[PDB]
Design a binder for this molecule. Sequence first.
Ligand code: CLF
Ligand code: CLF
Ligand SMILES: [Mg+2]
Ligand SMILES: [Mg+2]
Lengths: 465, 464, 473
Amino acid sequence: PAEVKLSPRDREGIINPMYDCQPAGAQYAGIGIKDCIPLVHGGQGCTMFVRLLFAQHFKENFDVASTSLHEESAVFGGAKRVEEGVLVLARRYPNLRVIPIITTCSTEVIGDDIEGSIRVCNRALEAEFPDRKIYLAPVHTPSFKGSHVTGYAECVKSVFKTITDAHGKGQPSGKLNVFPGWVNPGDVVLLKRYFKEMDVEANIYMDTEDFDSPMLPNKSIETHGRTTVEDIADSANALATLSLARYEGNTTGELLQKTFAVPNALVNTPYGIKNTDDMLRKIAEVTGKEIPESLVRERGIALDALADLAHMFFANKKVAIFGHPDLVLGLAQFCMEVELEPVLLLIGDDQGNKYKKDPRIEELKNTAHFDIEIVHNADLWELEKRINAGLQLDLIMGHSKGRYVAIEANIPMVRVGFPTFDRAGLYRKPSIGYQGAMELGEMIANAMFAHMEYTRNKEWILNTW
Amino acid sequence: AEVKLSPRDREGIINPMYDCQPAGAQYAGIGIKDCIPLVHGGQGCTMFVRLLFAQHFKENFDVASTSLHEESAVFGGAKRVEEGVLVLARRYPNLRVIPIITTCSTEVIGDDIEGSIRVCNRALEAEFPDRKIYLAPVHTPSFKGSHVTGYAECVKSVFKTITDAHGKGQPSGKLNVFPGWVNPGDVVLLKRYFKEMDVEANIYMDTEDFDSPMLPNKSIETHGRTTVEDIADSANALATLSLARYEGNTTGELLQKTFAVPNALVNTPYGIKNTDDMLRKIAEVTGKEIPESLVRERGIALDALADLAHMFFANKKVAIFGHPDLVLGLAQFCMEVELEPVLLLIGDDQGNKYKKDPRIEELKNTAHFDIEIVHNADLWELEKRINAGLQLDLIMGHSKGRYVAIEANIPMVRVGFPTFDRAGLYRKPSIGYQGAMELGEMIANAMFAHMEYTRNKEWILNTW
Amino acid sequence: PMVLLECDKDIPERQKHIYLKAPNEDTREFLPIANAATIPGTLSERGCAFCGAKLVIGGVLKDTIQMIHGPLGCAYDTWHTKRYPTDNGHFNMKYVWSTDMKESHVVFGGEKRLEKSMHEAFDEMPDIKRMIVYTTCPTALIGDDIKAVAKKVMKDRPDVDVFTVECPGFSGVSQSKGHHVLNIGWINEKVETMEKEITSEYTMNFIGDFNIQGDTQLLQTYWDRLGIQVVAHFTGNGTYDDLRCMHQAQLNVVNCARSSGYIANELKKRYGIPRLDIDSWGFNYMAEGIRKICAFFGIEEKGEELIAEEYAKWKPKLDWYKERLQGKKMAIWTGGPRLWHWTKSVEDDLGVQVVAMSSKFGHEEDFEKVIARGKEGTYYIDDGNELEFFEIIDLVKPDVIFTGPRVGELVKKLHIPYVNGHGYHNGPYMGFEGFVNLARDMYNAVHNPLRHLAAVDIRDKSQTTPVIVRGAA
Ligand code: CLF
Ligand code: CLF
Ligand SMILES: [Mg+2]
Ligand SMILES: [Mg+2]
């Protein structure tokens, strides 16, 4: 019988890392907050390289500051660099409200007391700016543990703890909290539409829609996170939390349940049809609202489109998928709905104890008719080496830092997850939901079609399908 | 420095760009609710066109044949029309509209379509007293024009038929909109624009539901949404907005002559300026302001195109083929993003009209590179010019040109009709601001994949 | 005078870093402070010392494992970000290596973790025999002895050669310190450890060129035409072993005197090899450079044949661009040297006015050079930050900004176009052809319909949408 096997990378070192380090993910969490400038306590590269990474994915600038740790502070302590950095930010950015103070390998190794610096800064800020409130959140993100996925989740949780500690529980809002995880602006646009069509009030944490900002006649800069202090504080007042990503915000939903008795509902990340269906069923359950006819229609249009592709072009084609764990596991399920065979799943960090318990692994074990290898703690050399050793793949799905693997092996690749810098506009295209499943399926087919043309592999067949 | 119009220099065609008139008339008709066109001619004239629509849309559309056979070629085919109408009416109880589309055969033999319509009207009134079926005569000989002209003729004839029957009533306050031959995605964009600008409008024909769901209840919803009532109400509109000179403007003029509904023909809204000017015309005729939401969509489109234009597009040479409104509009879009459309191919015998198109002058006054516009073109014209040394970086056209691009190793973006060799393109807008953005990003993504397959500076796709 | 910008009222120390050149001043009284500590919290453009070693210099090499001893982020962050092709399939851009430091290694030491990672890298790619190992913030802090580990690996693997760099990010103040440590370690440890065959009467090293979009390969067409053997390129399209041979050259030609002046200085001191500084950007600059190289070697006529052919090929296109770019205003916000390589070359060859310049990490030497060559009324900024860029834009109103892509994407919102002053748009930009490439991208950036369209508010009844007529050389 077919076997779904979990295995670790068998090397100590990394070649071609799948993810960045924790502080990068904490920066990504923070840039989704309005009137927020994260402050990365460590050497300058820890900031500047991540600002470049976000420019690669989004083709936009995001504001993140460094504490500029130098030799003196590496030897004698960096608290004064934190403290000066906070004050320089507040003095030069009058509308600044939130500063996640993100540690790095350096400042974790030397043991700077971030909570003590925050007390110093709160004192200093209260004296200098008696009419402002600036929220300083301690974010402990040593890069020698976890990855950007864990750092994202840690920063969301710390910021929510900080803001809700200050505000507490108050008037019930009647809204859902929604933690979609690390998704694109197009994913956020699709979720907002779903809630609007279902007549469900919701805050999406973080609201990154406006990362795709206009070039306007008045030259105004609108490239900002839309989640406010007020939105975050109101999370204590929600009817329920819908957590879409076990590794990308569910721990914040759990904290709000523990602290404020907001019930948390973790569902499978909504990649593919069944996972979207079950997300909408959970929203209906928690809210008492009906699923609208408009979503039945969108679902039906997606199924119509995928039916043009599945047995003709996808059946029995083997796929490798890499990316964030919620995305890898969700896309594996989507692939099987359209008769693709996801034979190799690669997840890129040290969280294997958690992944072994993910219920979607069992869901795959109970459905797959082909062997699946799930490599955890994987790097992208694990994919390249397996292709070199003879693994036959028809498709790769992953982010752009794997591009050379696909190019050299002459395998079509669909760009998913983060970062997708080597194609245009993908941050605007949904991947989740019904429309997203349709868009993903058509991206797969179109990549295969172009490959058939370039390789002259039955290219004449693209006429009467 | 020179924009030159020239005809194809061969009498024959190799690799035709367009189908014949009746195919275009069929396309017009399938956008009407409770309509089954009846194509009066041999069986291939129907079945091949139903297949063409299945290629583009991946859907069935209902069109019937009169099944002209040998006896009718000797004695005339009127009885095949008359039978075909009754057999439709008897077997499709909800049928309301039958455009009766002629073909080369039935134009050559001179069947009297209007005489057959009088017979069928009498028969139908006697047999179905509580039913009204509108029979529209559509004269579409294939030995002139093309599916473009046939589209325009059918729209006009259906509108004449239905408005003749109902005449002028109470003012509707709505616009009439003739977008021309566009995709369901283009219709979805236009509906959003009118909704955001608080402008009531009928879009003729409304083909949104051609992209129909596969539903739990097994219902078939693959239909045109434009009704008899919607067409009849065109007489009562505030104004007509015609987006396509060759694809429905002549119906806008007919409604202006017959019912004093003022027609406004504008450049087809490919690219930013043409979209801007369309919206200004809507504002002028309705008195409604252009909403902030469209300033923002425009700005998002410009932001995206600005990531592409000087880095990847500037000085790249483009050939474009397709319907004349699409070719001329895409040439203007290309120049906005620094592409150089050096070869425009338009596929039919309407050169005496194209020579007067104001967009030619807009190109002659703008371009800094020679442009050759070949009218009465086939797709061999493109292939032969490439074989003779024309250097192109991009082709934009429909899927029947695919082998030209494949063999020449030139990236190609699929636009216009039919686009059967890629998935989902009928759902993606090409017009408007979002459409300009989507077109530009298809261009870039086609270039990017080409760079990877050909190992042409493929390392550069990192920090653009 | 020196300038206190409004956005710097609460960090008034920045006045000593910003000079506005005015008539009759003795510029010796107005030299910006440079290469001093960064102010925390400013959104300085600076990067780290590790970046200067691995990303900028060592990582250019085509045949060398780049083993980053640290947690995974420093590796991730230096991969898919540079444009330095090679003639072996771009090995340097396809791969990055990390020791994947974990907490246990912080507590108990990372030397065995490095040693294992090095053996794995050599085992996974048996045809690669050269490696540079870099420290990062935490491996520096815990005192791992990477030289000792490298020596043990070399003993156990006689096929390999390893170089080590101690370059944590907090060293120095910027990328600059990584340049220094790498240069000095390379000449102390690896120069004079190999020789190559000398195949010309005329030999040189080309020092301080990193093959951005093929710059080095373009310049090599000149050296091949002139019959000059390049012993080593430091480090564009280079090999580890070529760099071991640098002591053999007769001449060191320097372009990037900031990153690579150190090794030229030490090669002159130790081996007597003269240092010749040139500008390998700029059309008339390139000619001067070739004439100096040829005068040194006594091959003046060969140099004049090359120059005459290159002018005949490229000068008419360059002059077409000058006609359309004359009087345009440019800003240069890059590392430092391109400010002094470009301010007077774009002025001389394209008629372009550089109105504002910012250096991430330049030294006072770099400011001496740029202010010598630059214009009056121009701003000269050491260690510029984001709010300063906005205020400078208001002051000088540039038509184009040469800067990195993220800042380009920021100033786009202000309808100001950019050219990538680091990785180029459509390069190479060095040499005669390269300056035409640079001019073409500048031209297409500013003469761009999208800028004009973005300015139009379609709600304004008084406004129309314009059409802009462009050109091509
Ligand atoms: S200033 Fe430079 S890039 Fe920064 S750590 Fe230091 S050498 Fe490196 Fe590394 S793993 Fe991530 S990115 Fe940092 S927190 Fe550490
Ligand atoms: S039954 Fe067969 S396909 Fe029909 S015409 Fe006759 S041989 Fe030909 Fe031709 S041009 Fe068009 S498709 Fe017709 S109307 Fe004439
Ligand atoms: Mg369908
Ligand atoms: Mg943008």
